[PDB]
């Protein structure tokens, strides 16, 4: 029936693109620099077919000359320029982008990638300026002045009083009274360093003697061939994307050319920073607060990601939720996993990486699952056969004998406390290597891995069964019942402190030891839980061939199960085993009181 076309209220649409969008006011410079960048791309694309387009002005630059005397922030470029007709349709019409139309008219096989594709970025300058005087000059027209007051109309006058520029556009921005912060040297350089740092064309800034200073001295490296970039060029690039003072340890520059084409130069720092990965679209900084881009345990990696086919919003400050950021997350981890493998091929280079990001690699084994087996290859720990140098889980299974089917390890508070633990002599007799875990995050990774190349990870501090022959198993069972009256006597003395007293043959040099059990937390795990700022069971064991325990066997034979003298030494031996196994005493005062009694009798103190 009645057919009507959609309309747009000018006096209301102008406000919706100023005071409702572009939540940040400092991005007005990011749009004007980008608008000057595509203008330099148009005049450059015409240079390959007609070199006479640059005879009016050969230099291509973006000059910014602040004038605090008249409260004006001038931005001058040497782009293609706009004619009288272009100042009316391309700049005077909302959502009309002359740059987007130029991209559709490019020849087959073009290499230029322009930024402007919406047609509303120019109107962002009104956030800090009340009126603008755009002075344009094209080779096919005269020099005109485009003046506006952010109202409902604009005025186009022929230039007769300003400078007779050769080619480009001059934007006279009369800044507001409350927005005079953009007239200083420091504030302008903060916006360029944040948004327009990697512009291909030089950005000149007039600083006050009048002199020019190029802000974008560090050119991006994702456009160049990765095989042609030297190591020193990656160091200067790392000092620009991040404020770190240390040179990068390893650089991974890859480029995926599948369904989603994007470049990424990921750097590995020398020290842990405790986002870090920036996102760029057509040489323009978009944002750096992408959650699903990089995992949590991988946040130590720095670098940038340059893509083209990304759903930019009106403000160009975020990406749309189109379910495309997950494939970038997969490729980043896929390349960094291989990047860590390339570091592992070098002996000295891996020592600096593992000593700086030891907890970062082990953290991925705890939460991440798809690359849990790949991160197990990077784990390096000390052992009884590798006390000096570090060894990996791959080198561990190569030294495992033919009759060993489990990987033995031990946790503790320090390395010196676990190197002489009484739990090692049980495996040293069988010539079994036992890894050393000295970091609080070590056990969190082994509890999630639980297996490496078919070998089950077993903790020696917990209860476990060691293989024995039929000739030795018969000798143990005959001796267990001999110490059965002693094990029951040790249970009534300790009471509910331990679940049971079992004769364990996994103790050679120590008279007694205490294990937590088979399941649940270990001895070191519960100690860490009770020590976190944001934040059990015991099994008592004795060695039947030690002179102390054998002397206690005859104590109960003469009716000394409830003797007064045996109660002091049993509690002393129990609390002593808590220190060697990694437990904490219930009260150190009572433990020191029993020790001071032995010191008194040792000095003949009555």
């Amino acid at each position: 029936g009645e057919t009507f076309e959609f309309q747009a209220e000018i006096t209301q649409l102008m406000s919706l693109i100023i005071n409702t969008v572009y939540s940040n006011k400092e991005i007005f410079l990011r749009e004007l620099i980008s608008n000057a960048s595509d203008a330099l791309d148009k005049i450059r694309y015409q240079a390959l077919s007609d070199p006479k387009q640059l005879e009016t002005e050969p230099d291509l630059f973006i000059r910014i000359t602040p004038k605090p005397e008249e409260k004006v922030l001038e931005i001058r470029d040497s782009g293609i320029g706009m004619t009288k007709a272009e100042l009316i349709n391309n700049l005077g019409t909302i959502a009309k982008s002359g740059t987007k139309a130029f991209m559709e008219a490019l020849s087959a096989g073009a290499d230029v990638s322009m930024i402007g594709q919406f047609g509303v970025g120019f109107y962002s300058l009104f956030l800090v300026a009340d009126r603008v005087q755009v002075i344009s000059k094209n080779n096919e027209d005269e020099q005109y002045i485009w003046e506006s007051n952010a109202g409902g109309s604009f005025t186009v006058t022929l230039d007769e009083v300003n400078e007779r520029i050769g080619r480009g556009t001059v934007l006279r921005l009369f800044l507001k009274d409350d927005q005079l912060e953009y007239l200083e040297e420091k504030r302008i350089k903060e916006v360029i360093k944040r948004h327009s740092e990697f512009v291909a064309y030089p950005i000149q800034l007039l600083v006050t003697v009048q002199e020019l200073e190029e802000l974008n001295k560090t050119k991006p490296l994702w456009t160049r061939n990765p095989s042609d970039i030297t190591q020193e060029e990656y160091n200067a690039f790392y000092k620009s994307i991040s404020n770190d003072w240390e040179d990068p340890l390893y650089v991974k520059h890859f480029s995926v050319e599948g369904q989603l084409e994007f470049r990424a130069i990921l750097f590995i720092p020398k020290r842990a920073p405790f986002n870090n990965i920036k996102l760029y679209v057509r040489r323009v900084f978009i944002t750096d607060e992408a959650e699903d881009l990089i995992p949590e345990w991988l946040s130590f990696v720095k670098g940038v990601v340059d893509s083209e086919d990304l759903p930019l919003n009106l403000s160009r400050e975020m990406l749309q939720q189109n379910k495309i950021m997950k494939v970038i997350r997969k490729n980043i981890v896929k390349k960094l996993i291989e990047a860590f493998n390339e570091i592992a091929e070098d002996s000295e280079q891996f020592d600096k990486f593992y000593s700086a990001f030891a907890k970062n690699i082990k953290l991925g084994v705890h939460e991440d699952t798809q690359n849990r087996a790949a991160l197990a290859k990077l784990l390096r720990y000390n052992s009884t056969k590798s006390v000096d140098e570090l060894t990996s889980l791959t080198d561990y299974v190569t030294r495992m004998p033919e009759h060993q089917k489990n990987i033995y390890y031990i946790t503790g508070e320090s390395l010196k406390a676990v190197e002489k633990s009484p739990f090692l002599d049980a495996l040293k007799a069988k010539n079994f290597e036992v890894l050393f875990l000295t970091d609080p995050i070590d056990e969190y990774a082994f509890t999630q891995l639980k297996e490496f190349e078919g070998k089950t990870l077993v903790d020696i501090t917990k209860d476990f069964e060691l293989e024995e022959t039929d000739e030795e198993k018969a000798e143990r069972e005959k001796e267990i019942k001999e110490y059965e009256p002693l094990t029951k006597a040790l249970k009534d003395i300790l009471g509910d402190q331990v679940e049971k007293v079992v004769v364990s043959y996994k103790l050679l040099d120590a008279p007694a030891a205490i294990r937590t059990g088979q399941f649940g937390w270990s001895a070191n795990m519960e100690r860490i839980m009770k020590a976190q700022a944001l934040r059990s069971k015991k099994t008592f064991e004795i060695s039947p061939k030690s002179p102390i325990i054998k002397e206690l066997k005859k104590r109960v034979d003469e009716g000394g199960a409830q003797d007064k003298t045996v109660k002091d030494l049993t509690n002393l031996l129990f609390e002593t085993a808590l220190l060697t196994s990694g437990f904490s005493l219930e009260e150190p005062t009572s433990f020191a009181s029993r020790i001071n009694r032995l010191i008194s009798l040792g000095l003949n103190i009555d």
Binding site: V207, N243, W245, E246, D247, R271
Partner: protein
């Protein structure tokens, strides 16, 4: 042009030990993990240059008083030739709380690097010392 910043960290260490932290070469390498000293002397002297953090940080002790003053000519390798900064350290040890508040009056830094050297000072100079030597709780 250049500008200047003002930092005021608090350390739980007296001025007798904190003053030797920035001079003892054996202790400087602890909280820096990378140092290049050109003099065989055990302690830093006046007009003595030394490179830090893989040679990117060049510093030179110009003048210093006994546990009260520390003046260094800090300069970054990424900076240009005429750019050069000067760090002025003043000790304000307070015996009532058993701590030392080191007033740092840093001048001579560029206008665009005033936040770069400030964000790294609380990581490579403040937090690095509080973590290696334990001069205060970090959280």
């Amino acid at each position: 042009n250049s500008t200047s910043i003002y930092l005021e960290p608090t350390f739980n260490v007296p001025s007798s030990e904190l003053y030797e932290t920035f001079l003892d070469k054996q202790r400087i390498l602890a909280w820096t993990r990378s140092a290049q000293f050109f003099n065989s002397g055990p302690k830093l002297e006046t007009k003595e240059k030394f490179e830090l953090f893989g040679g990117n940080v060049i510093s030179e002790l110009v003048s210093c008083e006994k546990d009260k003053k520390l003046v260094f000519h800090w300069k970054l390798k990424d900076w240009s030739a005429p750019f050069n900064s000067t760090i002025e350290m003043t000790f304000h040890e307070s015996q009532e709380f058993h701590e030392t508040k080191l007033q740092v009056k840093w001048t001579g830094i560029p206008v665009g690097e005033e936040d770069r050297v400030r964000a790294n000072f609380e990581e490579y100079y403040v937090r690095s010392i509080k973590l290696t030597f334990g001069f205060g709780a970090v959280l």
